[PDB]
Amino acid sequence: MDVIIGADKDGFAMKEQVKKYLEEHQYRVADVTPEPAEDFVESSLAVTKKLLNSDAHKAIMFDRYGVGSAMASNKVKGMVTAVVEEENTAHMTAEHNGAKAIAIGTGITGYDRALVIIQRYLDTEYAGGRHQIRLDMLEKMI
Amino acid sequence: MDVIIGADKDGFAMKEQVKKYLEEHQYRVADVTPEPAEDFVESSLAVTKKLLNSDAHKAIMFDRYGVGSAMASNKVKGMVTAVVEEENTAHMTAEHNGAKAIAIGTGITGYDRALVIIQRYLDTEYAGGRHQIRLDMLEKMI
Amino acid sequence: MDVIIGADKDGFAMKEQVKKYLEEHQYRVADVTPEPAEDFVESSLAVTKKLLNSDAHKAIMFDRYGVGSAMASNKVKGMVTAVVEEENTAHMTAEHNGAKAIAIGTGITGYDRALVIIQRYLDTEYAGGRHQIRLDMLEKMI
Amino acid sequence: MDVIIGADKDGFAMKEQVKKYLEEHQYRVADVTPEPAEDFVESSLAVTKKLLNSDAHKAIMFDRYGVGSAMASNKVKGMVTAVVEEENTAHMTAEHNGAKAIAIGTGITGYDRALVIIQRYLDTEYAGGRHQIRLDMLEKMI
Amino acid sequence: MIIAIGNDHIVTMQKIEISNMLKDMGYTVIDEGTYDTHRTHYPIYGKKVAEDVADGRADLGIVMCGTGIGISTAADKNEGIRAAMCDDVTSAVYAREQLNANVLGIGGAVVGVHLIQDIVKAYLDATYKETPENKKLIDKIDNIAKPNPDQKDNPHFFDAELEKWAEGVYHD
Amino acid sequence: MIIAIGNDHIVTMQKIEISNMLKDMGYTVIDEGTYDTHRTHYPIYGKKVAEDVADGRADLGIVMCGTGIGISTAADKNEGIRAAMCDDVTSAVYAREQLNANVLGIGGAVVGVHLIQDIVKAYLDATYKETPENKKLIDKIDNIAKPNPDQKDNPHFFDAELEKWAEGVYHD
Amino acid sequence: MIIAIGNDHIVTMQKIEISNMLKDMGYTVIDEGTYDTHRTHYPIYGKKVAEDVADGRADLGIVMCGTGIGISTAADKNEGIRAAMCDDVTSAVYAREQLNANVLGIGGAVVGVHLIQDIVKAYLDATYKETPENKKLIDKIDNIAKPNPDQKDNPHFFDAELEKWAEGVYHD
Amino acid sequence: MIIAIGNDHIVTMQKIEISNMLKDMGYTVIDEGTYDTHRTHYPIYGKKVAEDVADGRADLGIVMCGTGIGISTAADKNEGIRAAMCDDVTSAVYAREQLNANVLGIGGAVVGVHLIQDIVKAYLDATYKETPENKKLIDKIDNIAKPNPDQKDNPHFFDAELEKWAEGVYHD
Numbered sequence A, B, C, D: 001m002d003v004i005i006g007a008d009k010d011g012f013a014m015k016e017q018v019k020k021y022l023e024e025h026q027y028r029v030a031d032v033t034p035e036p037a038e039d040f041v042e043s044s045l046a047v048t049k050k051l052l053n054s055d056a057h058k059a060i061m062f063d064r065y066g067v068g069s070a071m072a073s074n075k076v077k078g079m080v081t082a083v084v085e086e087e088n089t090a091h092m093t094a095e096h097n098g099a100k101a102i103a104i105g106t107g108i109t110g111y112d113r114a115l116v117i118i119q120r121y122l123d124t125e126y127a128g129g130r131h132q133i134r135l136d137m138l139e140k141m142i
Numbered sequence E, F, G, H: 001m002i003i004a005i006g007n008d009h010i011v012t013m014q015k016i017e018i019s020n021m022l023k024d025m026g027y028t029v030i031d032e033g034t035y036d037t038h039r040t041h042y043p044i045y046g047k048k049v050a051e052d053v054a055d056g057r058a059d060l061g062i063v064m065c066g067t068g069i070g071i072s073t074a075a076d077k078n079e080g081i082r083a084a085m086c087d088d089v090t091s092a093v094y095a096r097e098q099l100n101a102n103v104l105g106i107g108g109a110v111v112g113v114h115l116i117q118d119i120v121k122a123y124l125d126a127t128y129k130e131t132p133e134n135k136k137l138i139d140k141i142d143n144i145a146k147p148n149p150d151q152k153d154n155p156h157f158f159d160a161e162l163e164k165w166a167e168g169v170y171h172d
């Protein structure tokens, strides 16, 4: 399974830890920010571009609060980014939403919790079915 | 105002950050673990002992998950420790419960959120009144 | 206390029973339909006219289903008629609404229940206060 | 379809009207109280005996309040009597409960409403399935 | 078919249950009544539902409040409307079949949800059966009130009272 | 005074409302009925409430289910109980004043909460007034059923049915 | 101040609680989200709330769904909006103070009502304080998306999907 | 397996949701917490749940109040109990796996029902993984408090406080 990751200066430290975690678990990781991005708009958009052009369907954005990376990346047509700070949304956003990526705020979420969130996200597949109408509506928007 | 703080090896880093924060914001801090405690049992009991002996009514325990420090210190007769991970409990536990101390897990809660939690806890006083019946019940238990 | 009553051919029997009841229980009754009205429109309007002209504030309309008399008399500007089939509305409509009259359907409500409904209605006064805004709104309508 | 009916002095008048209604609708009626029963215990028990010994599975008891006929007849082992004063229970008690009979209070329920209640009761069959456990429990009691 | 529905704050939960049922049954719903449970005034929603029906935006209306009396009375006090206050199936069917009532009122705090569902279904399933007798009754009913153009389709009709309310004129 | 209350899963919310009200009124409540809304069986709770009243653990009982018929009938089928199924105030008052009913049954789901409160209040406020006539009716009712010691105070009375349920015997 | 609010069927009850609170606080509320709990689609309400804010009909917006992700993302995908998905007070305050977010998204179903109230209150109480740094971030965010006149102020934008739904295209 | 559950009046509805889920999952439930929403005191139910677990009547316990702090602290203050206050899945799993916690506490007013369900499932699915390290921690924890025979299995333990409450000693 492929996973795209990116981060700004505030999310860089955690991004590095997660990358190590992902590699140790056999995941093929595409890091779009070997060096911290200028800001979360740059990192979140970098992850989005790489994702929508790759065969991967899982991505993780890191910044101080998560809110920013989601706010910025969701402006991209076809993109769906979920800010995640607890373990239910971690899987539900993948199951119900397109959740092409999740955003974690390093100033909000501790590392051990972030890992549980990430693993639940990566382990969950989109359910399709009735949920597709909402995704079709979202992909139609700017 | 006074604040008692302590931490084991996992919560030491944040404890040090918070101490500096508290000092900068005019707070007399009593650090009972200048060096990381053996474990959360030792650190939580150290904080509890110092609290139930000082004239301070606020305390912060730092460890990896929060749960341990609360589980340990709550075994002490008369002690009331609240694990805090979000901003509502941060103030409500002080307002309703004796909230003699809050426990923060560094593997669960990010630093920026921890500061908001701490500030809310420190800025809230016990309401007394009807809530006292519950505190009398708790202090009566082992 | 005064009570205005009236009925069409279907509610006449019960109206006669209630009149005797009310007289026995010290109640000055104004029967506007000594003989059954042509229909519930005629009887309900007769009761309404007599009410909005007398110094009484309680009235009982009798017909087969209750709905008709209320539907008709409520068309009169300033009138408020409540169909009553159970014991809670019996008093609440008086307490909250202008409840200038209640309508009882003889094909719907048994006599013993009708007496309890009537007694509750007669023993309850309008609460006024906040409820007045709604009555002012209603009296403003056609 | 067979229907067993019975009534005391207070429910006799309505019982007679319903009997006429039932005959006009091709129902085979078994009237156990051609003359009003001494009281509702006698009438309700008379209906119960005739029912539990007949091939009929529908019965109607009439008294002033309904409550009495149900209270008395339900003391008989295997009997299930429903006091009915509204149109939902009229069918639900048959669908879910054994509703071997329904009890109508003539001082509570008007004639037109009683007929709707009765027809809904007669038109509804027991659903069995999961509901049987509750009926098995009831038939086991005294 | 389109059903307009309204309610005061006391029965918003019961209104939601009926709205859900109507949609499951295939009806298009126009929800006018209050959307939360904040203290408000029944005449506002009764009038909104009434006008939807009278203007042809809805085929029939349903209104509810604690007892149903207040909002159904408000609905009745509008041109083109015949509102039937019915806490039972029997009179609701009579209202539709004989009086061709186009607005049904129910007491959401006095009638249980299962019975409310039954009343609504019975009322909707019923069909007006015209006869010279009921046509005469209906015509008389439609001619009792005197039309007030200042009320008809006037959204600001109750502004005067609402201002007073905000001014604390209606304190308890 | 002590009031025992019970219910099946369909009306747990209504039971909660009545429990709250009873406590505010100063009554001591013994809640027996089901505590959540997981599918269960009304006879279980009707029997529990019935025995609390019959054994003197409670002064009166109140039982509710969707229509009230199931649970009130279950309550009635116990020694020392006279259970009255009343969805209205009039018959509830009659039940207490004339039949000295010690268990009140109500249909949650069919009776609105405000009316349920009125029924309960009226029932409790009423007082049994013996008369040669109702004393005779009551005596008759108290002697219809044949006591079964195997049912009396036996909480395992329905175990055979509960096992059949767990084994899928009662599938739809 | 005017607050527009919306939601999908999973969190209508939580929306109602927030609507009540906002009104008690003195805010004027424009409820757009769904009014009952009948299955519907979060993008519809997120778009409605977004346009109320973007068109100046409302000062700020609040949207909720099970997790908040769906509806907040829908809101964000509109001209003039900066929607912040915040299940906590800290990031919500950051959203307002640093990103001047004008739409707040919350996950009903995952955040308890008391915390939801705190998030809303903190968000509203916060004030945007411009800085050379956040002004630059905001400008970037406001220019990522390409405006689509066919979407702007077009309430029929999702009609094609709604028809496919009515025709069973989106079956499970 | 048997799960004892308890709660104060603020979160009775959330407790009902969890009770329902546990039963659907095949667990036997002993509901101790308050059954309605009448103002009561969390220590009462925390103690009841704790003793069920300590005495072997239940395998594990779950307690909830507004924030969970009060009732989980009460549960912790009992012999044989290790109560874990967890508003998140991560620490709940740690509590079970490392500290062999036998009582889970959750804030029913701060955590949404979907997340509460996730925390409960995660906690129940987890298994204590003993190591010399955690056995040392657990043993230390089990030896902090000094056993009070007057509290252990004493139903009248809080009578003193309840009498004062009835006497108006704890007024606001």
Ligand SMILES: O=C(CO)[C@H](O)[C@H](O)CO
Pocket: C093, C096, C097, E008, E010, E042, E065, E066, E067, E068, E069, E070, E071
């Ligand atoms: O039933 C009502 C009007 O008839 C309302 O629900 C009540 O007045 C609100 O206080």
Ligand SMILES: O=C(CO)[C@H](O)[C@H](O)CO
Pocket: D093, D096, D097, F008, F010, F042, F065, F066, F067, F068, F069, F070, F071
């Ligand atoms: O009303 C009832 C029995 O009379 C129950 O609530 C119903 O059968 C449950 O499905």
Ligand SMILES: O=C(CO)[C@H](O)[C@H](O)CO
Pocket: A093, A096, A097, G008, G010, G042, G065, G066, G067, G068, G069, G070, G071
């Ligand atoms: O949370 C949601 C979308 O993010 C919705 O509430 C859910 O998909 C409805 O099934």
Ligand SMILES: O=C(CO)[C@H](O)[C@H](O)CO
Pocket: B093, B096, B097, H008, H010, H042, H065, H066, H067, H068, H069, H070, H071
């Ligand atoms: O959260 C609580 C205790 O921690 C309770 O729900 C609250 O004190 C009730 O007022």
